[PDB]
From a paper:
Inteins catalyze their removal from a host protein through protein splicing. In this study, we elucidated crystal structures of HEN-associated archaeal inteins inserted at the same insertion site (VMA-b), which is located within the A subunit P-loop of the vascular-type ATP synthase (VMA) from Thermococcus litoralis (Tli) and [name] (Pho).
The VMA intein from [name] ([name]) consists of 376 amino acids, which is considerably smaller than canonical HEN-associated inteins, e.g., SceVMA consisting of 454 residues but more similar to the size of the TFIIB intein from Methanococcus jannaschii (MjaTFIIB, 335 residues). The sequence alignment of the archaeal inteins also suggests that [name] intein lacks homing endonuclease activity due to the absence of the active site residues in Blocks C and E. To prevent self-cleavages during protein production, we expressed both inteins in E. coli with alanine substitutions of the catalytic cysteines 1 (Cys1). The crystal structure of [name] intein revealed the typical HINT domain of thermophilic inteins, which contains a β-strand insertion and the HEN domain structure. As expected from the primary structure, the [name] intein lacks the presumed HEN active site residues in both usually conserved LAGLIDADG helices (Blocks C and E). It shows a partial truncation in Block E, hypothetically indicating progressive HEN degeneration. The primary structures and the three-dimensional crystal structures of the VMA inteins suggest that the HEN activity of [name] intein has most likely degenerated during evolution and is inactive due to the lack of active site aspartate residues.
Residue numbers in the entry: -2 to 132, 137 to 251, 256 to 294, 297 to 327, 336 to 376
């Protein structure tokens, strides 16, 4: 086998958003020049796609030129403290590393040899994105600007899409006037703040508004099985995502959708926001804290581990990041054959996993 990952491993791409690598492979398969050797297959893509990777000290957009599928006789599963869970072939590479006076020093380690306590590299800040254009009756904003994203923030944070009706509950009357004002501004349709008998609420009665908001990917409400972040938000610029997130939080988020929680970790990473995920019973809890409680550094040119409050003093001393170092809590070998997948990029690394992780093929 080569250096490869489980088919459910999420990958952030420009062309398809956040997608499991087996589903990306099915879309790029054979679209180019193909080489088959037994159970392994390589395609040199006729049209390279765009993914994200570590390059010149930043997490940025990069080209991906080749795809791979084969079989591995077993896998390694690595669980870290922030909640990353990555399933990879034993020779797949990850990065350990340290913070020094002149930036990060990294070191490749095969997944088979990662042990608990290792500080592996994960992605805290994603640079990238561009304004997305969207698809008469209710007027619709033609690009996904900051105002539309702010509206969608409030909506998905505490709004439902009953009937052909939109309802948004809260206190803080200024938030609710803001939502109605933005609704009139963007869509030309307003609502009245019906002081409901539980608390205050805004309600907009427009059958075609809930419909285009559904087409945008807005969930009918929270507490739904397939709750997901609208695709276009992951692909948007940083200021748009900030307009969304500042509205979505008025700090923890409980969901029943594994996928939606993972997508949220990517959305927050696009703002450099440190995020953890935990699973209580069947529910997922996305917690929004800027780094771990201990940080691996180089002092005296020698390795050391510093608590957070000594690390911050040392870091302010030297001028301080897109990458941080998560702590492994569990390494497991799974002796089970499965299909594995890979994507070749110019940097020989890419950003994937249930939470943004720097993977090295
Ligand atoms: Ni290498
Ligand atoms: Ni940056
Ligand atoms: Ni509220």
């Amino acid at each position: 086998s080569g250096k490869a990952v489980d088919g459910d491993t999420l990958v952030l791409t420009k062309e398809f958003g956040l997608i499991k690598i087996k589903e990306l492979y099915e879309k790029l398969d054979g679209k180019g020049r193909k080489i088959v050797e037994g159970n392994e297959e390589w395609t040199e893509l006729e049209k390279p796609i765009t993914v994200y990777g570590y390059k010149d000290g930043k997490i940025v957009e990069i080209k991906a030129t080749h795809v791979y599928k084969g079989v591995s006789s077993g896998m390694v599963e690595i669980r870290t403290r922030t909640g990353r869970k990555i399933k990879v072939t034993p020779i797949h590479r990850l990065f350990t590393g340290r913070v020094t006076k002149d930036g990060l020093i990294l070191k490749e380690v095969m997944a088979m040899h990662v042990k608990p306590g290792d500080r592996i590299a994960v992605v805290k800040k994603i640079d990238g994105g561009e304004y997305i254009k969207l698809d008469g009756e209710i007027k619709v904003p033609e690009i996904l600007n900051e105002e539309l994203a702010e509206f969608l923030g409030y909506l998905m944070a505490n709004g439902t899409l009953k009937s052909g009706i939109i309802e948004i509950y809260c206190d803080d009357e200024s938030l609710l006037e803001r939502v109605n004002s933005l609704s009139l501004k963007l869509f030309g349709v307003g609502g009245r703040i019906v002081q409901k008998v539980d608390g205050k609420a805004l309600v907009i009665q427009s059958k075609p508004l809930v419909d285009v908001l559904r087409r945008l990917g807005v969930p009918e409400d929270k507490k739904v099985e397939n709750w997901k972040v609208p695709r276009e938000l992951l692909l948007s610029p940083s200021n748009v995502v900030r307009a969304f997130v500042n509205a979505y939080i008025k700090v923890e988020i409980t969901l029943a959708s594994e996928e939606g929680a993972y997508e949220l970790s990517y959305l927050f990473a696009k703002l450099g926001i440190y995020v953890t995920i935990s699973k209580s019973g069947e529910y997922y809890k996305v917690r929004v804290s800027g780094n771990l409680d201990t940080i691996p550094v180089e002092v005296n040119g020698m390795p050391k581990v510093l608590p957070y409050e000594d690390f911050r003093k040392f870091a302010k001393s030297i001028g301080l990041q897109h990458i941080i170092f998560d702590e492994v809590i569990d390494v497991r070998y799974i002796p089970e054959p499965q299909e594995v997948y890979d994507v070749t990029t110019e940097t020989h690394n890419f950003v994937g996993g249930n939470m943004p992780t720097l993977l090295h093929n």
